Amino acid sequence: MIVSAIAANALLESVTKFHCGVIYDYSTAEYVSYRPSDFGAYLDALEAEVARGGLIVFHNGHKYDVPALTKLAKLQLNREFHLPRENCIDTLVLSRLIHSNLKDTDMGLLRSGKLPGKRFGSHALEAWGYRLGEMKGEYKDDFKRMLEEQGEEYVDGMEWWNFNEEMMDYNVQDVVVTKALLEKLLSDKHYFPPEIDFTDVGYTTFWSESLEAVDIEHRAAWLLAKQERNGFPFDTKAIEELYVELAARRSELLRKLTETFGSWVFNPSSRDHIQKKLQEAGWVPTKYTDKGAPVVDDEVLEGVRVDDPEKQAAIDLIKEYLMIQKRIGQSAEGDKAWLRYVAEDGKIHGSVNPNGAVTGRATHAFPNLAQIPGVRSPYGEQCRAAFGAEHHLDGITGKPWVQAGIDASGLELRCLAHFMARFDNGEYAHEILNGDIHTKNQIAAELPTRDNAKTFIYGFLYGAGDEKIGQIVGAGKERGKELKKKFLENTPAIAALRESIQQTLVESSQWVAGEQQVKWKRRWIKGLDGRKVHVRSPHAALNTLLQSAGALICKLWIIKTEEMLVEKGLKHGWDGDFAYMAWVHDEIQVGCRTEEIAQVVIETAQEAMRWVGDHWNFRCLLDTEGKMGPNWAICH
Amino acid sequence: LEESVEETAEDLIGLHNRVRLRQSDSLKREIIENGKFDQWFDELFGNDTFHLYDSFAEAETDRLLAKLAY
Amino acid sequence: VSITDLRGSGALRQLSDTIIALERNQQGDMPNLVLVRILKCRFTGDTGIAGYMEYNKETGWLEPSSY
Amino acid sequence: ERIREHLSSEESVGLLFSGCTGINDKTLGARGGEVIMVTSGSGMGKSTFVRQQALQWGTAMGKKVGLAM
């Protein structure tokens, strides 16, 4: 096993030159420093550990280091360099796996004065140096202050322009933190057994003798990192033709909404507006917002009735206006608007954090690819059309690629059937397969319509009170208790589900001054792969359990699907046959060169989904549904 | 005479490595993909200590006792 | 039903790797209720009563029962 | 190689008995090479139970099922 970290001139998207890199070998117990004229030997040193079947330790290597060293080797050395996914370890991923509950952990770290306020809960290399006590300083700061006593100034991120001896010393600093952080993660015996000193093993022993969660997360991080580099093809012209239809509508709406109110200036998106208005048109607020004056409150606006017809009719103009700002602020004027993120390949490369959550459901940002308005939401149809494989060319024919959208068919309710198959012997599970589970929940909870059962089952499982439940039948917090208790009597298994599991984490509970001081057995629920999935209050926790199952199911699902597609003969990327464009929890969007490839993609995903269920011996049956088409509005 | 040599070896391999390789769809795939199968396999049978019989197609006496005697 | 009630000589108690058995009282209050009993499983060795099932006179299927 | 071939190419747990879980909990389905023994009283659902397995396997989990009625 070797440990390293590198320093380049820029980010993964325009890096040009390799500066330095340090390699600590556990077998040699000694570091080795590299320099710009030593880039070639650096790649061989990594190849040598691959030949031995050892391991290579990087921080964020799956997402940056490994693809950058592949990219740098092509333009600088003109050689092909591809670190095998099996021979790579990412401390960042393990940190996100092992220490997903950092947010609490920092409380004691704050008391010490050892952890910066800007580096709270962060999983960056330097942020961990302060946690372990290895930060003698930071390269960026030993650069700025020393530039003063040299004359010349500082430009935002110029410390990486040129190879400097201070970078070479802080390049070591990043390596020793990676090593100590690795051993800090290897010292967690829940994930890494004591019987195996993983610091001196081959890759073959590392993955299997480690917890299964260790393997998936590195497979998940590697695949999704490929997805970011693949990117999502984007029709720039289409979104441009929308801002025109929106800005014109905004100005036309703004004009009509300035005839209704004067000044001494009507504001599009201000909170000091409705606060000044409606309570002058004859509207007395039903619900307020905190220390002073109610917020925008989109909810009440639908029900605001004022005796002024013009003011009343203007309410719906406000409803549209605010929404127009939302799409615009997401598609054009936002600091993280889509038009700002289109790369020079005609694609949007939205990033994704693998286990950036307690449960394992990922997070998307810059731009949040997982919040694009739905086709049911206004103008979402046009929005979804802007994200499509058709908006990509082709390596040869040029004929637009076809998109394949496959989602997990009702994963949440089937996950519920799996954990409750422990109490009903597959009763509820068969109701899924037999169909109309929302019809049974309707009968069990005594709801008038099937749609009311749908909004019930999800709210009840996740800890909704009685207001959302009461508003279903046009009531308040009153109606809810009898709706929840009746469902419990008609579905004992669900009640029995929360019995053994919720009493598996407690010995006895106790209320002290309004705070439950529960004596825990373990403040963490085990996931499908043995990882720690904490919760908070034992009053529900089920929501955490089900979402953990679902997110862990899809994570393995998208891994095996790609694994089978590669095994069948398909090549991953825009230069091969298919390319992952976006992963959104229970649905995925895959680009495909021909319709024939897309059909295989759909079938393989179903084959992988049954494979996952057999793998973890899932009590319930998992199915998926695929849609073929040009873009995303079609795949959903 | 009730399990083919691959299944009995499967038991022996798992038993040798303190696991139930038969009763884990997860463990079977594990040692295969990360190359842990050949590792345990050479560790056990590498000394040519284990030898088996396979036919399972209605074993007889003449001549099977001959094979046992042989 | 146990292993002795099995038709044929005592070879079926040996060759069969897994033995599924159904029991139901068609002259009682629950004729469609059928009990599943594992009599043998060389694979797991876990024997005993698995679960319950009900014969849907409409579909003719064996839907899994509670208990 | 035959051991390699077995673990890799067999469906592991080739299928799971449908109509009732718990059977899967105690048997983990049926494998390739074993012999599942189904029995009950005269007209108590021996044929009906097995016929569901033949149907389900050949429909949901597209296996090629052979029948000898």
Side-chain angles (χ1 to χ4, degrees), chain A residues 282-304:
Chain A
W283 174 74
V284 184
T286 299
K287 45 201 301 175
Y288 288 78
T289 315
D290 212 32
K291 51 163 173 290
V295 80
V296 30
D297 202 343
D298 342 77
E299 177 81 288
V300 68
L301 286 176
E302 177 65 62
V304 170

PDB file of all heavy atoms in Angstrom, chain A residues 282-304:
ATOM      1  N   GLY A 282     -57.527  44.486   2.745  1.00  0.00           N
ATOM      2  CA  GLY A 282     -58.511  43.823   3.568  1.00  0.00           C
ATOM      3  C   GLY A 282     -58.201  42.392   3.936  1.00  0.00           C
ATOM      4  O   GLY A 282     -59.133  41.588   4.053  1.00  0.00           O
ATOM      5  N   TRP A 283     -56.933  42.045   4.128  1.00  0.00           N
ATOM      6  CA  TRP A 283     -56.520  40.680   4.426  1.00  0.00           C
ATOM      7  C   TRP A 283     -55.835  40.662   5.783  1.00  0.00           C
ATOM      8  O   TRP A 283     -54.831  41.355   5.984  1.00  0.00           O
ATOM      9  CB  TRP A 283     -55.590  40.143   3.337  1.00  0.00           C
ATOM     10  CG  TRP A 283     -55.001  38.801   3.648  1.00  0.00           C
ATOM     11  CD1 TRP A 283     -55.644  37.599   3.613  1.00  0.00           C
ATOM     12  CD2 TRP A 283     -53.645  38.522   4.026  1.00  0.00           C
ATOM     13  NE1 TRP A 283     -54.777  36.589   3.953  1.00  0.00           N
ATOM     14  CE2 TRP A 283     -53.544  37.129   4.211  1.00  0.00           C
ATOM     15  CE3 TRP A 283     -52.512  39.314   4.230  1.00  0.00           C
ATOM     16  CZ2 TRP A 283     -52.355  36.512   4.589  1.00  0.00           C
ATOM     17  CZ3 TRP A 283     -51.333  38.700   4.605  1.00  0.00           C
ATOM     18  CH2 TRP A 283     -51.263  37.312   4.780  1.00  0.00           C
ATOM     19  N   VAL A 284     -56.375  39.883   6.711  1.00  0.00           N
ATOM     20  CA  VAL A 284     -55.795  39.729   8.042  1.00  0.00           C
ATOM     21  C   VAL A 284     -55.101  38.373   8.095  1.00  0.00           C
ATOM     22  O   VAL A 284     -55.780  37.341   7.970  1.00  0.00           O
ATOM     23  CB  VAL A 284     -56.855  39.855   9.145  1.00  0.00           C
ATOM     24  CG1 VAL A 284     -56.191  39.794  10.507  1.00  0.00           C
ATOM     25  CG2 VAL A 284     -57.624  41.152   8.986  1.00  0.00           C
ATOM     26  N   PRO A 285     -53.789  38.326   8.283  1.00  0.00           N
ATOM     27  CA  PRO A 285     -53.045  37.057   8.189  1.00  0.00           C
ATOM     28  C   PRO A 285     -53.529  35.937   9.109  1.00  0.00           C
ATOM     29  O   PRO A 285     -53.643  36.123  10.324  1.00  0.00           O
ATOM     30  CB  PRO A 285     -51.615  37.479   8.550  1.00  0.00           C
ATOM     31  CG  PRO A 285     -51.542  38.934   8.196  1.00  0.00           C
ATOM     32  CD  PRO A 285     -52.904  39.490   8.463  1.00  0.00           C
ATOM     33  N   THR A 286     -53.789  34.758   8.532  1.00  0.00           N
ATOM     34  CA  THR A 286     -54.139  33.584   9.336  1.00  0.00           C
ATOM     35  C   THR A 286     -52.920  33.025  10.062  1.00  0.00           C
ATOM     36  O   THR A 286     -53.018  32.589  11.216  1.00  0.00           O
ATOM     37  CB  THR A 286     -54.762  32.507   8.444  1.00  0.00           C
ATOM     38  OG1 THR A 286     -55.961  33.010   7.843  1.00  0.00           O
ATOM     39  CG2 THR A 286     -55.091  31.254   9.250  1.00  0.00           C
ATOM     40  N   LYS A 287     -51.765  33.031   9.401  1.00  0.00           N
ATOM     41  CA  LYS A 287     -50.535  32.429   9.892  1.00  0.00           C
ATOM     42  C   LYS A 287     -49.399  33.428   9.714  1.00  0.00           C
ATOM     43  O   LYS A 287     -49.288  34.062   8.660  1.00  0.00           O
ATOM     44  CB  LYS A 287     -50.236  31.117   9.144  1.00  0.00           C
ATOM     45  CG  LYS A 287     -50.427  31.214   7.632  1.00  0.00           C
ATOM     46  CD  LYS A 287     -50.628  29.846   6.999  1.00  0.00           C
ATOM     47  CE  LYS A 287     -49.440  28.938   7.259  1.00  0.00           C
ATOM     48  NZ  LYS A 287     -49.670  27.554   6.758  1.00  0.00           N
ATOM     49  N   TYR A 288     -48.563  33.581  10.744  1.00  0.00           N
ATOM     50  CA  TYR A 288     -47.455  34.523  10.683  1.00  0.00           C
ATOM     51  C   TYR A 288     -46.140  33.775  10.467  1.00  0.00           C
ATOM     52  O   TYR A 288     -46.104  32.547  10.359  1.00  0.00           O
ATOM     53  CB  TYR A 288     -47.369  35.350  11.972  1.00  0.00           C
ATOM     54  CG  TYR A 288     -48.446  36.395  12.172  1.00  0.00           C
ATOM     55  CD1 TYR A 288     -49.718  36.041  12.607  1.00  0.00           C
ATOM     56  CD2 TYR A 288     -48.180  37.739  11.949  1.00  0.00           C
ATOM     57  CE1 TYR A 288     -50.697  37.000  12.800  1.00  0.00           C
ATOM     58  CE2 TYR A 288     -49.152  38.702  12.138  1.00  0.00           C
ATOM     59  CZ  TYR A 288     -50.408  38.327  12.564  1.00  0.00           C
ATOM     60  OH  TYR A 288     -51.379  39.283  12.753  1.00  0.00           O
ATOM     61  N   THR A 289     -45.042  34.535  10.406  1.00  0.00           N
ATOM     62  CA  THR A 289     -43.691  33.985  10.242  1.00  0.00           C
ATOM     63  C   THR A 289     -42.716  34.658  11.211  1.00  0.00           C
ATOM     64  O   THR A 289     -42.108  35.680  10.877  1.00  0.00           O
ATOM     65  CB  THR A 289     -43.217  34.123   8.796  1.00  0.00           C
ATOM     66  OG1 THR A 289     -44.266  33.730   7.906  1.00  0.00           O
ATOM     67  CG2 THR A 289     -42.007  33.230   8.554  1.00  0.00           C
ATOM     68  N   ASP A 290     -42.580  34.084  12.399  1.00  0.00           N
ATOM     69  CA  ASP A 290     -41.472  34.331  13.337  1.00  0.00           C
ATOM     70  C   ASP A 290     -41.556  35.753  13.911  1.00  0.00           C
ATOM     71  O   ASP A 290     -42.652  36.296  14.095  1.00  0.00           O
ATOM     72  CB  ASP A 290     -40.146  34.004  12.658  1.00  0.00           C
ATOM     73  CG  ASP A 290     -39.108  33.472  13.634  1.00  0.00           C
ATOM     74  OD1 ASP A 290     -39.510  32.793  14.606  1.00  0.00           O
ATOM     75  OD2 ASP A 290     -37.900  33.726  13.436  1.00  0.00           O
ATOM     76  N   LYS A 291     -40.387  36.355  14.162  1.00  0.00           N
ATOM     77  CA  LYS A 291     -40.255  37.495  15.074  1.00  0.00           C
ATOM     78  C   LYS A 291     -41.079  38.705  14.656  1.00  0.00           C
ATOM     79  O   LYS A 291     -41.498  39.498  15.509  1.00  0.00           O
ATOM     80  CB  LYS A 291     -38.780  37.895  15.180  1.00  0.00           C
ATOM     81  CG  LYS A 291     -38.098  38.093  13.829  1.00  0.00           C
ATOM     82  CD  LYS A 291     -36.805  38.884  13.964  1.00  0.00           C
ATOM     83  CE  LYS A 291     -36.032  38.939  12.655  1.00  0.00           C
ATOM     84  NZ  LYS A 291     -35.457  37.614  12.302  1.00  0.00           N
ATOM     85  N   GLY A 292     -41.308  38.876  13.361  1.00  0.00           N
ATOM     86  CA  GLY A 292     -42.047  40.027  12.891  1.00  0.00           C
ATOM     87  C   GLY A 292     -42.463  39.914  11.440  1.00  0.00           C
ATOM     88  O   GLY A 292     -41.620  39.725  10.559  1.00  0.00           O
ATOM     89  N   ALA A 293     -43.771  40.021  11.194  1.00  0.00           N
ATOM     90  CA  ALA A 293     -44.399  40.024   9.876  1.00  0.00           C
ATOM     91  C   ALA A 293     -44.304  38.672   9.174  1.00  0.00           C
ATOM     92  O   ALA A 293     -43.296  37.964   9.287  1.00  0.00           O
ATOM     93  CB  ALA A 293     -43.794  41.115   8.988  1.00  0.00           C
ATOM     94  N   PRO A 294     -45.352  38.286   8.454  1.00  0.00           N
ATOM     95  CA  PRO A 294     -45.344  37.010   7.729  1.00  0.00           C
ATOM     96  C   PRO A 294     -44.461  37.039   6.486  1.00  0.00           C
ATOM     97  O   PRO A 294     -44.257  38.080   5.860  1.00  0.00           O
ATOM     98  CB  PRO A 294     -46.816  36.814   7.355  1.00  0.00           C
ATOM     99  CG  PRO A 294     -47.365  38.210   7.295  1.00  0.00           C
ATOM    100  CD  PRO A 294     -46.657  38.964   8.376  1.00  0.00           C
ATOM    101  N   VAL A 295     -43.929  35.865   6.139  1.00  0.00           N
ATOM    102  CA  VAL A 295     -43.098  35.684   4.951  1.00  0.00           C
ATOM    103  C   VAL A 295     -43.968  35.736   3.696  1.00  0.00           C
ATOM    104  O   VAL A 295     -45.171  36.016   3.774  1.00  0.00           O
ATOM    105  CB  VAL A 295     -42.307  34.361   5.035  1.00  0.00           C
ATOM    106  CG1 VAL A 295     -43.179  33.163   4.637  1.00  0.00           C
ATOM    107  CG2 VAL A 295     -41.015  34.427   4.211  1.00  0.00           C
ATOM    108  N   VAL A 296     -43.355  35.484   2.532  1.00  0.00           N
ATOM    109  CA  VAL A 296     -44.075  35.465   1.257  1.00  0.00           C
ATOM    110  C   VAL A 296     -45.334  34.612   1.363  1.00  0.00           C
ATOM    111  O   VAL A 296     -46.420  35.013   0.922  1.00  0.00           O
ATOM    112  CB  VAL A 296     -43.144  34.969   0.132  1.00  0.00           C
ATOM    113  CG1 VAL A 296     -42.116  34.004   0.689  1.00  0.00           C
ATOM    114  CG2 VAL A 296     -43.943  34.302  -0.977  1.00  0.00           C
ATOM    115  N   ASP A 297     -45.205  33.429   1.963  1.00  0.00           N
ATOM    116  CA  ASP A 297     -46.318  32.512   2.185  1.00  0.00           C
ATOM    117  C   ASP A 297     -47.089  32.232   0.901  1.00  0.00           C
ATOM    118  O   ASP A 297     -48.194  32.750   0.699  1.00  0.00           O
ATOM    119  CB  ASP A 297     -47.260  33.053   3.263  1.00  0.00           C
ATOM    120  CG  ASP A 297     -48.090  31.960   3.915  1.00  0.00           C
ATOM    121  OD1 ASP A 297     -48.187  30.855   3.338  1.00  0.00           O
ATOM    122  OD2 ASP A 297     -48.658  32.206   4.999  1.00  0.00           O
ATOM    123  N   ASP A 298     -46.497  31.419   0.027  1.00  0.00           N
ATOM    124  CA  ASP A 298     -47.166  31.013  -1.202  1.00  0.00           C
ATOM    125  C   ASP A 298     -48.482  30.300  -0.907  1.00  0.00           C
ATOM    126  O   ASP A 298     -49.431  30.387  -1.695  1.00  0.00           O
ATOM    127  CB  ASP A 298     -46.225  30.113  -2.002  1.00  0.00           C
ATOM    128  CG  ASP A 298     -44.777  30.245  -1.549  1.00  0.00           C
ATOM    129  OD1 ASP A 298     -44.427  29.680  -0.489  1.00  0.00           O
ATOM    130  OD2 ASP A 298     -43.986  30.908  -2.251  1.00  0.00           O
ATOM    131  N   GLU A 299     -48.538  29.581   0.217  1.00  0.00           N
ATOM    132  CA  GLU A 299     -49.713  28.805   0.605  1.00  0.00           C
ATOM    133  C   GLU A 299     -50.954  29.679   0.770  1.00  0.00           C
ATOM    134  O   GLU A 299     -51.982  29.450   0.121  1.00  0.00           O
ATOM    135  CB  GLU A 299     -49.402  28.049   1.900  1.00  0.00           C
ATOM    136  CG  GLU A 299     -50.549  27.237   2.471  1.00  0.00           C
ATOM    137  CD  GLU A 299     -50.714  25.897   1.790  1.00  0.00           C
ATOM    138  OE1 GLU A 299     -51.166  25.870   0.627  1.00  0.00           O
ATOM    139  OE2 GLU A 299     -50.385  24.869   2.417  1.00  0.00           O
ATOM    140  N   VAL A 300     -50.888  30.678   1.656  1.00  0.00           N
ATOM    141  CA  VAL A 300     -52.074  31.473   1.971  1.00  0.00           C
ATOM    142  C   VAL A 300     -52.533  32.260   0.751  1.00  0.00           C
ATOM    143  O   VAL A 300     -53.724  32.561   0.611  1.00  0.00           O
ATOM    144  CB  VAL A 300     -51.806  32.411   3.163  1.00  0.00           C
ATOM    145  CG1 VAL A 300     -50.805  33.490   2.779  1.00  0.00           C
ATOM    146  CG2 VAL A 300     -53.106  33.018   3.679  1.00  0.00           C
ATOM    147  N   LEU A 301     -51.605  32.588  -0.152  1.00  0.00           N
ATOM    148  CA  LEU A 301     -51.928  33.407  -1.315  1.00  0.00           C
ATOM    149  C   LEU A 301     -53.032  32.774  -2.154  1.00  0.00           C
ATOM    150  O   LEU A 301     -53.861  33.483  -2.738  1.00  0.00           O
ATOM    151  CB  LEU A 301     -50.665  33.611  -2.151  1.00  0.00           C
ATOM    152  CG  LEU A 301     -49.636  34.587  -1.585  1.00  0.00           C
ATOM    153  CD1 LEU A 301     -48.401  34.613  -2.470  1.00  0.00           C
ATOM    154  CD2 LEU A 301     -50.235  35.972  -1.455  1.00  0.00           C
ATOM    155  N   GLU A 302     -53.052  31.442  -2.239  1.00  0.00           N
ATOM    156  CA  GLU A 302     -54.125  30.758  -2.955  1.00  0.00           C
ATOM    157  C   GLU A 302     -55.480  31.022  -2.304  1.00  0.00           C
ATOM    158  O   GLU A 302     -56.507  31.048  -2.992  1.00  0.00           O
ATOM    159  CB  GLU A 302     -53.835  29.254  -3.008  1.00  0.00           C
ATOM    160  CG  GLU A 302     -54.914  28.404  -3.669  1.00  0.00           C
ATOM    161  CD  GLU A 302     -55.098  28.712  -5.142  1.00  0.00           C
ATOM    162  OE1 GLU A 302     -54.134  28.520  -5.913  1.00  0.00           O
ATOM    163  OE2 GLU A 302     -56.208  29.136  -5.529  1.00  0.00           O
ATOM    164  N   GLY A 303     -55.502  31.221  -0.987  1.00  0.00           N
ATOM    165  CA  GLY A 303     -56.718  31.438  -0.236  1.00  0.00           C
ATOM    166  C   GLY A 303     -56.991  32.864   0.197  1.00  0.00           C
ATOM    167  O   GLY A 303     -58.019  33.112   0.836  1.00  0.00           O
ATOM    168  N   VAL A 304     -56.102  33.806  -0.116  1.00  0.00           N
ATOM    169  CA  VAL A 304     -56.298  35.206   0.257  1.00  0.00           C
ATOM    170  C   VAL A 304     -57.487  35.782  -0.505  1.00  0.00           C
ATOM    171  O   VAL A 304     -57.482  35.844  -1.740  1.00  0.00           O
ATOM    172  CB  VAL A 304     -55.030  36.029  -0.009  1.00  0.00           C
ATOM    173  CG1 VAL A 304     -55.329  37.506   0.163  1.00  0.00           C
ATOM    174  CG2 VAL A 304     -53.912  35.613   0.924  1.00  0.00           C
TER     175      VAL A 304
END
